[PDB]
């Protein structure tokens, strides 16, 4: 992974030694080059994962997450360089440094063999994320959002550290390849019930699970655009990625310990979808849509079937590109009217015809129109959940209906109807903005041609 | 104070600490404590004001009392063993008295009341000696007598220190009182692991001293003693605010910073001994420390507080403070985690 | 060696340099009372360093290349604006007096440092000890608020206590009616707006508070308008003073070392002039503060520490 | 209640440069920032990556 770690570290000198007016050009150009080379991780075999060294390995679960991560960096830079135009030069270079260091921690998080190395990087991602929200957020509430983000995470992460360390004492290793062969069953007992909770609750908070989600709509409403892109696209998927790994050593206790969390997810996805129907803030709406989508991922991981993991992997990738695109679209509106209220600016298809096309495409993926990878992921989870218990089709079906309702509600409210008379500063969409949206949607639709590369290790 | 007199007294503070750490005889250990106390009082009284006099008096009364329980423990040990060698004590009452004596010297809860008041009442440079160098001598004794220490007593002191240190810091705006309650909380971690692995007590003590010196040195750099005055630093030395943010996040124990190393290694040694509840409780309660560290970051680095017009006169003058070792200490406070296995040198 | 405990240990002690001529002299008086002429002539005859009265741009004159900086870097406080509209909403009146006291505080520290390190006396025009007379005059006229005076007294209390008062306090008495007339002859249109009640308050403060207080701690010489004209007769009075009172009798090399440490460190001198007391007249919002501080570092020779700016000719930076 | 810089005006990037791509105020830098995004983003990653 050095061929990806080292060039990522080199982005820091490049930004700092770049000419004053070339920071965005140089960082964007070379971070795109790194994203290009990330495709070499697709050297995946049917039986054995790609194990480079004692420290890093790559399988079909981490590879699409790595490619999504390195793709997101140049996209984050394009999205940020307009609202940071008046920022001090050295503070620009520090903002880019926080994003580069977030990529550094993320690519090492997804490739660490051992769970303690994964834990340290899993937690290191907090520091840059917290700094971005609080230093470069816009409103007063960014300080509270940083605190809820920090302490919700740690309240779950700290028990996980204890549990992981205990596992190494008893098993002798936390290397994930070793755990595959030395995994022993978990028997019933209160000591194991709390070991199960310790191993899972840190990841539940990241997804986030329904009930423990109230930090996420806070962070999204207060983060700068780049913060919201990485938070939605990748950082949420740290919890899912960790679950797909750690459930290996929690069997068969997952058989009955999953019941409280499947009920929260199955009912929670209906509640959070319905909340989206009454949201007044466009960013909060998109935030509450992530909670609904990630409820499917939680259920899929917890029922542990070959179809459910294949669906879980596709959703995390599909959701990552769609949610990031939706945040960028809303942000482009915000950069004009300087408000996140959804009802403030209406009928924008009249004034920005091509940006209404992007709004349409993003909404169609969000509601999982086939054959988008958004639906391939959703369908696989529904197929497996049906075999789990046939009644789940009722909750799954209702959620799809409501999911279409608020997805098109948002499109209709902002793009259709009559425009707002007194808003007269809606400038034509910039080439930067149009390219930003296309670099989300075009990969997302391209993946329907070769969906195997995002289905995960159980393909 | 004469410069030569200041140096001689400062060397006597160190001499007393060294005597405690190289002595094999309980009487010489006691002498080392008396010598250290006699030489630190004039450093507290240096600026001669009613608050320094109050701090020095409260320090003397607490240290003088603790020294008396220590000597009582030594004499009881002589009665029941007929020897003076510094090692495990031979009487459970001697161990209790010596353990309480050392808890008072360290300012551990519920013997903690003096630490916030004495630290507040003395200059920053004297507070630096108090919260760092003065921890070495009592800890070196604990390191040598831990086999006879009562487990329930030592772990109760650890738990109370972490809770009271965590809660006490929430209500503070004075930097010297925030560092005092931070010190109490961190002492609890050092003693919590002492029954299990004394090497981790040393690791935690060393890293705490590095980070505490880094904060005090940066407070001294701008002569800041309150939250609000510290909030003007961004408008004077922007670099100093980034160093404070990084160090405060490290003290809070966040990966991938150095300050996570002691919490990580102590949790490991306690779980090897089937201690799960205590380290879990300790880590969660340490979130109190992270909370009132985070506030300092908000008012210092991550926002920009209102300044004053006269601040502009300061833009034209360079920092003149010595800031000794600050570049090295700040790097050690933050970037040591990759070198954690180096802890075996303390073994 | 820069001065410090090591240099003091090796022999650098203030009592070596100082003599019967190492004196700090301050010339006070109302506006247009002849201070500057008298002070400059006292300095030459006695062979002392002369510090002109500390203005808004005194600090500029001691750093960088010594030329005044644009007014936005002193907070836009203006003496002319004070005379035009002393009751301004923008609080320029107290922002000026707060700034001027800090400037005087810095000049006093520089004056003391010159005396201690070289042994040569200095002559000043007003000082931190008499600066309050302008404050009281402003308050009596309602130019500033009660809170501003409270703030001024807070700052003064924690800064003036560290220093030693002047050996000699030369004072020139010129009654207000003559001061009036001498202002028009100056021809500055802004000064001529000065009211006599304002000048009377200045006089009352000098004769009500300053002179009585300084008599217990310094040598005070009062002169009338004509008495002040013969600078030689003023110097003659100074040369035969007894010097038998005040805190300078109690100073020993241990105390003067501690004093010299303070005055050579200008950020320690100015520490408390910016205490976090949020008066409207001296509070600056984050955006204004940040934007102006960026401009300041863009001035020639100001980005880096003196001796490391190669945009103004500094050399060997890679070995410094 | 203090000395504050008022709220700055919104700056339309188009008025100074009607041909702005929205990347930068300087036209030459704005052209280069567009070429790298399009060439590397579309011509390289998406076409050769696909």
């Amino acid at each position: 992974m050095l061929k990806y770690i080292i060039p990522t570290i080199m982005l820091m000198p490049l930004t700092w030694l770049s000419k004053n007016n070339m920071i965005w050009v140089n960082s964007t150009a070379h971070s795109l080059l790194i994203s290009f080379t990330s495709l070499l991780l697709m050297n995946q075999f049917g039986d054995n994962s790609l194990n480079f060294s004692l420290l890093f390995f790559s399988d079909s679960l981490s590879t699409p997450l790595l490619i999504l991560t390195m793709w997101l960096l140049p996209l984050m830079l394009m999205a940020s360089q307009h609202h940071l135009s008046k920022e001090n030069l050295t503070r620009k270079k520090l903002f880019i440094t926080m994003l580069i260091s977030l990529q550094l921690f993320l690519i090492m998080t997804f490739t660490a063999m051992e769970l303690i190395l994964f834990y340290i990087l899993f937690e290191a991602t907090l520091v840059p994320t917290l700094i971005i929200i609080t230093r470069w957020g816009n409103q007063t509430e960014r300080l509270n959002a940083g605190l809820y983000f920090l302490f919700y995470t740690l309240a779950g992460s700290l028990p996980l550290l204890v549990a992981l360390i205990y596992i190494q004492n008893t098993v002798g290793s936390l290397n994930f390849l070793m755990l595959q062969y030395w995994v022993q069953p978990v028997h019933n007992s209160w000591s194991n019930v709390f070991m199960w909770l310790a191993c899972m609750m840190a990841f539940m908070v990241k997804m986030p699970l329904y009930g423990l989600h109230l930090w996420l709509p806070k962070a999204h409403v207060e983060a700068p655009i780049a913060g919201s892109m990485v938070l939605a696209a990748v950082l949420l998927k740290l919890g899912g990625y960790g679950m797909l790994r750690i459930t290996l050593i929690l069997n068969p206790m997952t058989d009955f310990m999953a019941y409280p969390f499947i009920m929260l997810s199955l009912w929670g996805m209906i509640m959070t979808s319905s909340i989206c129907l009454r949201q007044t803030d466009l960013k909060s709406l998109i935030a509450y849509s992530s909670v609904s989508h990630m409820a499917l991922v939680i259920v899929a991981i917890l029922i542990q079937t070959p179809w459910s993991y294949m669906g879980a992997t596709a959703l995390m990738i599909a959701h990552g590109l769609t949610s990031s695109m939706l945040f960028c679209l809303a942000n482009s509106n915000y950069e004009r009217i300087h408000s996140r209220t959804m009802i403030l600016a209406r009928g924008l298809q009249t004034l920005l015809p091509l940006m209404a096309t992007w709004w349409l495409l993003a909404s169609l993926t969000n509601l999982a129109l086939p054959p988008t990878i958004n639906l391939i992921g959703e369908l696989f989870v529904v197929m497996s959940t049906f075999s789990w218990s046939n009644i789940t089709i009722i909750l799954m079906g209702v959620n799809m209906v409501i999911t279409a309702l608020y997805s098109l509600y948002m499109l209709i409210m902002t793009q259709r109807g009559k425009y707002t008379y007194h808003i007269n500063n809606i400038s034509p969409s910039f080439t930067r903005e149009n390219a930003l949206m296309s670099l989300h949607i075009l990969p997302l639709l391209l993946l329907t041609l070769n969906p195997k590369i995002i289905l995960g290790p159980l393909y | 104070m004469n410069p030569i007199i200041f140096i001689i007294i400062l060397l006597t503070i160190m001499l007393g600490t060294i005597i405690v750490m190289i002595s094999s005889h309980w009487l010489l250990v006691w002498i080392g404590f008396e010598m250290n106390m006699l030489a630190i009082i004039p450093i507290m009284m240096k600026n001669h004001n009613p608050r320094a006099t109050e701090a020095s008096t409260k320090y003397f009364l607490t240290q003088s009392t603790a020294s008396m329980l220590l000597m009582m423990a030594v004499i009881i040990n002589l009665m029941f063993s007929g020897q003076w060698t510094v090692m495990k004590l031979f009487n459970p009452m001697a161990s209790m008295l010596m353990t309480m004596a050392l808890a008072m010297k360290l300012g551990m809860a519920p013997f903690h009341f003096w630490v916030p008041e004495v630290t507040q009442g003395i200059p920053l440079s004297s507070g630096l000696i108090l919260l760092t160098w003065q921890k070495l001598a009592p800890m070196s004794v604990l390191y040598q007598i831990f086999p006879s220490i009562n487990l329930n007593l030592i772990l109760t002191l650890s738990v109370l220190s972490i809770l009271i240190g965590g809660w006490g810091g929430l209500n503070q705006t004075q930097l010297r009182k925030i560092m005092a309650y931070s010190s109490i909380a961190h002492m609890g971690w050092m003693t919590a692991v002492l029954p299990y692995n004394p090497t981790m007590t040393l690791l935690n003590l060393i890293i705490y001293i590095i980070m505490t010196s880094t904060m005090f040195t940066m407070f001294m750099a701008n002569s800041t003693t309150t939250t609000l005055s510290l909030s003007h630093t961004w408008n004077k030395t922007p670099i100093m605010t980034v160093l404070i943010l990084a160090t405060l996040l490290s003290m809070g124990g966040l990966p991938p910073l150095s300050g996570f190393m002691p919490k990580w290694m102590i949790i490991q040694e306690m779980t090897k001994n089937n201690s799960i509840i205590l380290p879990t409780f300790m880590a969660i309660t340490a979130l109190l420390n992270l909370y009132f560290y985070m506030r300092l970051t908000y008012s210092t680095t991550l926002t920009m507080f209102p300044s004053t017009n006269n601040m502009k006169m300061k833009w034209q003058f360079p920092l003149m403070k010595k800031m000794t070792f600050l570049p090295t200490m700040v790097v050690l406070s933050t970037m040591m985690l990759p070198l954690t296995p180096m802890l075996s040198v303390l073994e | 060696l820069q001065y410090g405990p090591l240099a003091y240990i090796l022999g650098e002690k203030a009592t070596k340099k100082m003599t019967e001529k190492s004196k700090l002299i301050t010339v006070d008086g109302n506006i247009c009372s002849g201070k500057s002429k008298l002070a400059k002539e006292i300095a030459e005859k006695l062979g002392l360093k002369h510090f002109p009265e500390a203005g808004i741009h005194y600090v500029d004159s001691t750093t960088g290349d010594g030329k005044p900086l644009p007014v936005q870097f002193s907070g836009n406080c203006s003496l002319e604006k004070f005379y035009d509209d002393p009751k301004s909403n923008d609080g320029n009146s107290y922002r000026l007096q707060a700034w001027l006291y800090a400037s005087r505080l810095l000049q006093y520290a520089d004056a003391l440092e010159h005396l201690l390190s070289t042994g040569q006396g200095v002559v000043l025009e007003r000082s931190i000890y008499s600066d309050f007379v302008f404050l009281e005059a402003m308050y009596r006229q309602g130019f500033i608020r009660k809170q501003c005076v409270d703030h001024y007294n807070q700052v003064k209390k924690v800064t003036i206590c560290e220093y030693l008062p002047p050996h000699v306090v030369v004072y020139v008495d010129v009654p207000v009616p003559e001061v009036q007339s001498r202002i028009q002859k100056k021809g500055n249109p802004h000064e001529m707006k000065i009211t006599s009640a304002y000048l009377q308050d200045i006089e009352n403060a000098y004769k009500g508070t300053f002179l009585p207080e300084m008599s217990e701690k310094c040598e005070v010489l009062q002169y009338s308008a004509w008495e002040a004209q013969d600078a030689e007769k003023v110097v003659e009075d100074i040369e035969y003073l007894k010097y038998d009172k005040g805190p300078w009798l109690d100073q020993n090399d241990r105390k003067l070392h501690k004093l010299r440490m303070l005055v050579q460190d200008k950020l320690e001198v100015l520490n408390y002039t910016s205490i976090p007391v949020f008066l409207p007249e001296v509070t600056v919002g984050a955006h204004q503060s940040d934007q102006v501080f960026q401009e300041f570092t863009e001035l020639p020779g100001r980005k880096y520490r003196a001796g490391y700016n190669e945009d103004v000719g500094d050399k060997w930076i890679w070995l410094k | 209640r203090w000395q504050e810089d008022p709220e700055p005006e919104d700056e339309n990037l188009y008025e100074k440069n009607p041909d702005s791509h929205g990347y930068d105020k300087d036209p030459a830098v704005d052209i280069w920032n567009m070429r790298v995004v399009f060439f590397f983003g579309f011509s390289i990653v998406l076409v050769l990556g696909s």
Binding site: N138, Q139 | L228, P306 | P276, F278, A286, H287 | W2
Partner: peptide, 19 residues
């Protein structure tokens, strides 16, 4: 819309003897 930064009313929350 300019980024919000602490004002006097916000900063006075930290100027008291206690929090």
């Amino acid at each position: 819309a300019r980024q919000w930064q602490p004002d006097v009313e916000w900063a006075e929350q930290y100027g008291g003897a206690v929090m």
